[PDB]
Structure of pii-like protein PZ:
Amino acid sequence: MKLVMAIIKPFKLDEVREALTSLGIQGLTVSEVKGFGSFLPKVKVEVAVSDDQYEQVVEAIQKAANTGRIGDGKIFVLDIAQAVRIRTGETNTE
Amino acid sequence: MKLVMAIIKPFKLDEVREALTSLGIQGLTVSEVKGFGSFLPKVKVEVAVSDDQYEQVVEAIQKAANTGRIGDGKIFVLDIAQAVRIRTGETNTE
Amino acid sequence: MKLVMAIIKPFKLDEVREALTSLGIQGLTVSEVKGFGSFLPKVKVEVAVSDDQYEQVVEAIQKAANTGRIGDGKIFVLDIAQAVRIRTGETNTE
């Protein structure tokens, strides 16, 4: 599993949601953050994705969140060492 | 050190707190996030734990946050490359 | 790239901002979190930094956020496997 995190313009959240839903990605977690540099509001999207699917997810988010203008933000991929499903206590394979 | 992150049902936060406190875990950091898919409120818990203790922490959170119903969420473990204590400027060994 | 995350006392945010701005670091992302243990308000700062610069960033944050008293918090460095600039769709080298 990989954690895909993106810091996006807030008005692109619905486009990102549509792209992820269309791909069948579950577990989208959203929070509001401040992009300092005093600040511009941003949305942080996070989703944990299988190793097999993460690059597709990165590309989908990138295309949906893009404007080509400054401030578009970045997508980060971090390795997840272990993921546990709380419902069943099961550790991941994918 | 490992970063343990869990996305839980908000009404399980106090159970998770009790479990972590009983284990002597410090540094619990909590935020409110939105589980989209428009959304259900969730709580994100994060704690940085020694390599020696992280699996116990994962298990404690899982048992405390479990209902067995859909939406229970996941726990993610990410490797921390370096942790610095701000109070003293000291880098971790554990 | 590395993700540098710090959980700091809220009244040190402006000092941390000054230190990062002076170093020419961009992309500072800030959120408000709760340090439980019911809680004290904290600020979470996050910035993705090149491998070449991350230790300087860690040191700058540490010095700016320090009081020497309990509750100062920690800085965590996590490896980023891939970073994509949303504006251009470009993957990182640094």
In short: The two ends of chain B are 6 Å apart (CA to CA). Strands of chain B lie at 2-8, 29-36, 39-49, 74-79, 82-85, 90-91.
